[PDB]
Structure formats: C-alpha cells, structure tokens
Amino acid sequence: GLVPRGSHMESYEMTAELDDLTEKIRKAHQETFPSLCQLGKYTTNSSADHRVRLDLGLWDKFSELATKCIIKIVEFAKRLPGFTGLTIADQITLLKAACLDILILRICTRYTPEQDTMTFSDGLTLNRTQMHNAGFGPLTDLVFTFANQLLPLEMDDTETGLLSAICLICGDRQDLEEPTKVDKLQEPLLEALKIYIRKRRPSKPHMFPKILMKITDLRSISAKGAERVITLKMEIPGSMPPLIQEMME
Template identity: 45%
Template sequence: MDLTNGPEPCVVCGDAATGYHYRCMTCEGCKGFFRRTIQKNLQYHCKWNNNCAIDKTTRNQCQFCRFRKCIDVGMATDLVLNEKQRIAKRKLIEDNRERRRAETVTIKAKPDTPTSDDLTDEDQNIIDDIVIAYEQTAIKVTKTYPVPDDESVPKEKVDENSIDVWQQLAEVMTPSIVKVVEFAKRVPGFLQLNVDDQILLLKSCCMEIMCLRAACRYDPVNRTLTLQNGLLLKKNQLNHGGLGLLVEPIFDFAVGLSKLQLDQTEIALLAAVLLMQSDRTGLKEPEAVEKLQDAVLGAYKRYIAEQRPMQPVHWAKILMKVTDLRTISTRHAERVLCIKLDSPGELPPLFLEMFDEGAQKI
C-alpha cells in the first residue's frame, strides 16, 4: 500500500482500506462481511431495486447490493477458508510460533555453540596429528653447499632423455620418497583405507609432496633453493647439471608459495590434502578417501578462518597451489613416459614405480 497521500479507499464502500483481502483492496468491515457471507452461506434480498448505492454510510443498509458489489469488484469466494481449513491454519500458526519459541530457548541455553567457522575438538586432533606426522618425517638439512659460480663451465643444454640424468635424480630423491611414505602412514585414517588405494594415493602424491617440501626450503632474500641433499641452487645455475630438469618448475612454484607466508601447520595440512585426493583415477573405494579428505579440508579451512580472519581469499590461494603441484607432477610423469617408450628397460626402477601410468592419470 502507498500511504504517501493517506490510506487508499476500499473498492467496495470507499472507507479507508487496510490491505488486500480476497484479491481486492478493502476495509476491515467489507473483508469481514464478505468472509461471513461465504462461510455461513448467507442469502440476502434487496428491499428496493437491486441497485443500491454502497458507500461508507450506506453499506449496512442493503446486504444484497453490498455483497453483489464485492463480487463485481473481484473479491474471490474461493479464497475464503471453511471451518476445517481455518482450524488447520490456526494450528499451523501456533505450531510455527511454538517452534520459534523453542529455537530461541535453545540458542539462549547454548550461547557457545560453535559456528561452521569455529575449530572443533575433532578438528584440533586431526591438525595436531598431521603436524606431528609432518615434522617427524621431515628431512633435516644440516649442511649446505653451493654450486660454484665457474664461468668456465659450459652451460650446454641438458639432454633430458639421458638415463644418467634420471639415475642422478633417483639417487637424490630416494630418501625423500621414504619420508613421504612414513608421513602418509601417520596421517589419521590412511592405514584404514583399502591397501590398493593406499598404494595408488602414495604414487600419485609422492612427487607433489616432495616438490612442496623442496619449495619450503626456498630463500626469497637470496633467491636460493636448498635440495634435500644440501645442494644450494640459484635458478641461473640449473643448466649446470641434470637436476635442472626437475628443479626449474619447483623454483617457479617456490617463489609463488613464499608470498603466501604459510606457517608450519598450513604446510603440513597442505601435504595431507595432496595425499587425500579422492578424484585419483583407479581408486577402488573413493568414498572412503573422500570422507578423510573432507575431514582434513574442513579442519584446514576452519584453522585458516581462525588464524587469518582478515584474509578471506587466503584459502582459495592455497587450493590453487594444490593444482600447481599436480600440474608439475603430471608433466614429470609425461617426460618419464616418453623416455620409457624411447629407451625401454633403462630407466631406474624407482621412476617406473613412482610414475606408473595408471597412478598418474589425474
């Protein structure tokens, strides 16, 4: 109703209307008159010529003409509730009022009920277990040694199809692979998964977690990356050996990761997320993996909401890093497959196991 210029008139008698009743703008008097007529099935007769003028002062003089005008202006008889319908409606209203009162009492009785963004005790237990697992399986780099800046060393293009290159990489990566396996076994729920699914998840995430751990050893001040064997590298030195084949994409990833300034808990949880990917092709029981994945993601998201309330997009940026790591791993798997086709039987068994075709289709 537009009350700017006062109340609108009732379309039946011209009195001040109170709203739409039975599809027409009417006053309370005409609304009640129309309802009673229909509910009681009342019959009226005009004492005059069946054409009485109906207004505010005459509306009670001829009920027949008043009701006929109600019909003529469009009041709907089918909208008037019968006695059974009125009782049902009244009960529904009372039920809704009672439900709202009960909800109000519940809220007052439990003022500390956690919201969806609050860390639960279960979340904290998951986080604690994962952080401990990650820290206990980390490779401690106690001594570093840089690659000498010897300009006399020719910076020739590394042949990435060289078996020697991949053998060198296998030797460097072996300790890290062992640590990834140990980490996975300590993540809550992992050992309860189907054994074949455990193996598939490990194959799929191993390179991703190793890349993550290597990227965390990036020094943004000196722009150096420390490998697990203590080798201290700068990006412009990658052409000096076969390690450049593996390390260059990790270098680029590490630069972006360092800008997020993740704490140790966030890093550990990110590693667990990489492990628990329920969309890995070939899983026999993906629902079980998805259940663990949801628990880790939920705890992770709520941890970030609590620790970084002023950084609403931080969570989205972390999920993008998961995609980046999976892309790096997939590219290495494609390289291994090409070499396997060109030089069958010459690749180190470690790589044939890690980059098994079935485990790397993501």
C-alpha cells in the same frame, strides 16, 4: 615481556577434534621433512655457471635424494589418520597419484629467494641453473616460479602438511577401490585447513581458496614430470632408480 592490548580480540569456537588432527598432520610433516632453519646448507660447484643438457654428476645426487624423500612421503602417508585403514591397492594408487605433486610442494618450501636456490634434506643447496642441470631441464623455471608464488602465502609446516595430506587423500583418483572412504578421510583435512587458516590469518579471509588453488598449480607441473621421466631415461646411462619408476609408472 608484556603483550600489549590490541583491539577486537578474535573469538573462535571449540574445534578440539580438528585441533588434534591438525597437530598430528603438523608433526607428521615436520618429522618426515626437516625445515630450512634446521638444515645445515652446503653447495657444490658442479656446473653452477651455465645450463647444460644434464649434469650426470648432479643427477646421481638428485635421484638418490629423490629416492629418500619418496620413502619419507610413504612414512608421512602412513601417519595420516586412517590412511593405513585403506586397502593396500588404494594406498598405492593414492601415493602414485600424488607423489610428484607433494615432492614439488616440499622442495618449493625449501626455496631461498635472495639466493635463488632450493635446499634438499641433506642440506645440499643448488641455484636455479644447477637445478636445471640436475634433471629439472625445461621445468626449472616452472618450479621456481611456483616456489616464488608460494612466498606471499607465508605457509608454515601445519598448512604445508595439511595441503600435502589433502593432495594424497583424494577420492577422485582413477582406479580406487573405496573412493567414498577416501572422500571421508579428506573432509576433516579440508576442515582443519580452513579453520587453521582462519585462526592464523584472521585479517585475510580469501586465503583458504587461494591456498587450495595451489594444488591445481601442482598438478599442472607434475603432469609434465611424466614427460620428463621419459626424456631423462634416454640421457642417463643405465636405469632409473627403481622406486622412482614405481611412482611414475
């Protein structure tokens, strides 16, 4: 059809290099994390009715899905330009530092507000009480609140991928070998995000710092995830899935 004439049609400068980086981050996110619209949802009925200490049945599924998404986050990291150019030690340090933060961000982009649910990458859809019983425990309300706070930012895959990339590629992590090289990787990621937000939301200028501040909320939440690892270790029979332990050590 016809696109009618608006008013004051936005001008922007050439940002061809950042445009391509933006496209690469978007594809890397999309290809390592399906969207809600491309997932076929299904529920379980296990302990949907009331909060319990831990649904030992839901925890098996949740931890296995968690294992698989950690693998996807390593794949996403390897596709960010330059990440594999860092030493293996720094790659590990960056992933360990940011894994839980990115995983929270990812699962909160799978929030269906009307149903009060979150959807995992195999389609499994749990309501709030089931997310509690699956292992979120006392962090359920904090994670569901974060997911609600994200909705008015109306982030898409590009912004979600760029925010993940920025969270991972962080030169502030303790025990980095080449923290200045990590800082150099991060600078175009901050720029691309800022330019993307300007192009997509020309009528809302404060959106760059507002979206950046979400990282500071993520860290508030994943900081408590450590304490939960220890609580869960005492409730589950046998061992925590080993990749989860490597990321939480």
